[PDB]
Ligand binder design. Structure first.
Ligand SMILES: O=C(O)CNC(=O)C(=O)O
Ligand SMILES: [Mg+2]
Ligand code: NI
Ligand SMILES: [Zn+2]
Length: 331
């Protein structure tokens, strides 16, 4: 069995190997990459996502989210408070202000220490989930706006045509902006490109150990657990690496830098934080190996998690028994 300790693997494809996305994901998996739940892909040196980032300041962040924490330093939830619209130019200025900027630090490790010590005492503002793309239409390789769709994958594997579309999302981040512990909708893969700015640190639990995280989460967030049988779908819970180590939860960590891709694999729980002003683009995708995860994915039916139009059809075709109750949660 390849990669039995489930370590995060880092890949360095040649420009030739960068041509066929599906084939390269399949190569990574042949080397055991999926066992970690997360892989890093450094693009060939010849490749670029676009020519420059000099003209992005007029993109609108219609609903910036202030991320307010409750709990203790290592075990907390976060809620999102909606703020007034601002442009990317305005957001970058705010990220760089004395109130919100990255503190002085020695190295990534010192910054990580400062994150876990101090995150809960601040409420950073995140421009998340903004439909759109920063890839130039002439970038032909690993263009997250030109991938094969999840609906076409299901049609190719299963023979059923379904409604829905699949488009990318932009994330504009600042120091301490946080992504809570989650897997993707319907336990899909995701791919994330860090277009510009400061790094993003990731933590991940191997898929084969996901249930261990869920059991710890039920213990640490006991009211949430009673309210919903899949409350991690709400994407609000944070658990520090110190707490995971104290509870024997297997995980790994890695820092992504500008110009690098990260791929999350089906049922790979992940969480993390941004180091400073940055912009990432991400999208879900599927492969034939996903189908069996999709069929078994937990769902939120308390109604909090409220998800895309396109997820309907996945639940309807792959999880027909769940379908009824789940759409009651959606309506
Ligand atoms: O970048 C972020 O805030 C969150 N991204 C993801 O969880 C992902 O790409 O799967
Ligand atoms: Mg612009
Ligand atoms: Ni994710
Ligand atoms: Zn729920």
């Amino acid at each position: 069995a390849q990669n039995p300790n489930c370590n995060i693997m880092i890949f360095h494809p040649t420009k030739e190997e960068f041509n066929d996305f599906d084939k390269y994901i399949a190569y990574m998996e042949s080397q055991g990459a999926h066992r970690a739940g997360l892989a890093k892909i450094i693009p060939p040196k010849e490749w670029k996502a676009r020519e420059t980032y000099d003209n992005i300041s007029e993109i609108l962040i219609a609903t910036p989210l202030q991320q307010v924490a409750s709990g203790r330093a290592g075990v907390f939830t976060q809620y999102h408070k909606k703020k007034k619209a601002m442009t990317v130019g305005e957001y970058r200025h705010l990220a760089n202000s004395k109130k919100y900027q990255t503190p002085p630090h020695q190295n990534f490790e010192d910054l990580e220490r400062k994150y876990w010590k101090n995150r809960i005492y601040n409420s950073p503002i995140y421009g998340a989930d903004i439909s759109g793309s920063l890839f130039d239409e002439n970038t032909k390789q690993w263009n997250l706006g030109h991938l094969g769709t999840i609906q076409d994958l299901l049609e190719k594997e299963c023979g059923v045509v379904i409604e829905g579309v699949n488009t990318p999302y932009l994330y504009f981040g600042m120091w301490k902006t946080t992504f809570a512990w989650h897997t993707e909708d319907m336990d899909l893969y995701s791919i994330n490109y860090l277009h510009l700015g400061e790094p993003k640190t990731w933590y991940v639990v191997p898929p084969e150990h996901g249930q261990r995280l869920e059991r710890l989460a039920r213990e640490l967030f006991p009211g949430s657990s009673r309210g919903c049988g899949a409350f991690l779908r709400h994407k609000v819970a944070l658990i520090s690496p110190t707490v995971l180590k104290e509870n024997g939860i297997p995980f790994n960590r890695i820092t992504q830098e500008a110009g690098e891709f990260m791929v999350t694999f089906p049922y790979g729980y992940h969480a993390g934080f941004n180091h400073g002003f940055n912009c990432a683009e991400a999208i879900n995708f599927a492969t034939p190996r996903w189908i069996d995860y999709g069929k078994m994915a937990s769902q939120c039916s308390c109604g909090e998690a409220r998800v895309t139009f396109s997820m309907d059809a996945f639940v309807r075709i792959l999880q027909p028994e769940r379908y009824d109750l789940w759409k009651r949660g959606q309506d």
